[PDB]
Design a protein around this motif. Structure first.
Motif, PDB file in Angstrom:
ATOM      1  N   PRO A 145       4.856   7.133  -0.291  1.00 36.82           N
ATOM      2  CA  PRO A 145       5.922   6.931  -1.277  1.00 36.82           C
ATOM      3  C   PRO A 145       5.973   5.497  -1.789  1.00 36.82           C
ATOM      4  O   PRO A 145       7.002   4.828  -1.690  1.00 36.82           O
ATOM      5  CB  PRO A 145       7.195   7.266  -0.496  1.00 36.82           C
ATOM      6  CG  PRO A 145       6.844   7.011   0.929  1.00 36.82           C
ATOM      7  CD  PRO A 145       5.386   7.355   1.064  1.00 36.82           C
ATOM      8  N   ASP A 146       4.857   5.028  -2.338  1.00 35.02           N
ATOM      9  CA  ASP A 146       4.776   3.672  -2.868  1.00 35.02           C
ATOM     10  C   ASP A 146       5.967   3.369  -3.770  1.00 35.02           C
ATOM     11  O   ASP A 146       6.405   2.222  -3.873  1.00 35.02           O
ATOM     12  CB  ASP A 146       3.472   3.482  -3.643  1.00 35.02           C
ATOM     13  CG  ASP A 146       3.540   2.322  -4.617  1.00 35.02           C
ATOM     14  OD1 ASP A 146       3.777   2.570  -5.818  1.00 35.02           O
ATOM     15  OD2 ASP A 146       3.359   1.167  -4.178  1.00 35.02           O
TER      16      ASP A 146
ATOM     17  N   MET B  45       0.828  -1.201   0.000  1.00 38.07           N
ATOM     18  CA  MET B  45       0.000   0.000   0.000  1.00 38.07           C
ATOM     19  C   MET B  45       0.865   1.256   0.000  1.00 38.07           C
ATOM     20  O   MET B  45       0.834   2.045  -0.945  1.00 38.07           O
ATOM     21  CB  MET B  45      -0.928   0.006   1.215  1.00 38.07           C
ATOM     22  CG  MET B  45      -1.857   1.208   1.264  1.00 38.07           C
ATOM     23  SD  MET B  45      -3.262   0.955   2.366  1.00 38.07           S
ATOM     24  CE  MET B  45      -4.391   0.084   1.282  1.00 38.07           C
ATOM     25  N   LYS B  46       1.639   1.437   1.066  1.00 36.06           N
ATOM     26  CA  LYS B  46       2.514   2.595   1.189  1.00 36.06           C
ATOM     27  C   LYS B  46       3.602   2.348   2.229  1.00 36.06           C
ATOM     28  O   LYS B  46       3.329   2.016   3.381  1.00 36.06           O
ATOM     29  CB  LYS B  46       1.702   3.835   1.571  1.00 36.06           C
ATOM     30  CG  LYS B  46       0.897   3.665   2.848  1.00 36.06           C
ATOM     31  CD  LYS B  46       1.378   4.604   3.941  1.00 36.06           C
ATOM     32  CE  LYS B  46       2.067   3.844   5.064  1.00 36.06           C
ATOM     33  NZ  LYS B  46       3.536   4.085   5.079  1.00 36.06           N
TER      34      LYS B  46
END
Length: 12
Positions: free
Chosen positions: A11-12, A3-4
């Motif tokens: 900032p994937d 997800m992140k």
């Protein structure tokens, strides 16, 4: 699947 890594606008 992810997800992140960080919070900074996700900032994937």
């Amino acid at each position: 699947m992810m997800m992140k890594p960080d919070m900074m606008m996700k900032p994937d």
